[PDB]
Amino acid sequence: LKLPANWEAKKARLEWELKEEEKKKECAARGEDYEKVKLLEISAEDAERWERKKK
């Protein structure tokens, strides 16, 4: 209660970001750059929508 009302929602975000960091460490343990793995794991349709948000 003395902590912020959103602190657990912030914690849930931080745990989700740490799970992204855990996936990064998992790729590094396998022996690959996490950026290169992610490019192999992306589906193009997400980038399409991104460009439309810009446009």
Partner: protein
């Protein structure tokens, strides 16, 4: 039975997956020319193979 595309939610099913072909770090081979990339007077000695062009 052999699986390669999905990431099963059962770990017992994860064991069935075929180990995917890892890439080779092409940058490591690039390093040899990147070591050649040192800026030097490449007539380091009067080596006529450099001084006189080949055929």
């Amino acid at each position: 039975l052999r699986l390669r595309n999905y990431v099963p939610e059962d770990e017992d099913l994860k064991k069935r997956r075929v180990p995917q072909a890892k890439p080779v770090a092409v940058e490591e081979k690039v390093k040899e020319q990147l070591e050649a990339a040192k800026p030097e007077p490449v007539i380091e000695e009067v080596d006529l193979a450099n001084l006189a062009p080949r055929k």
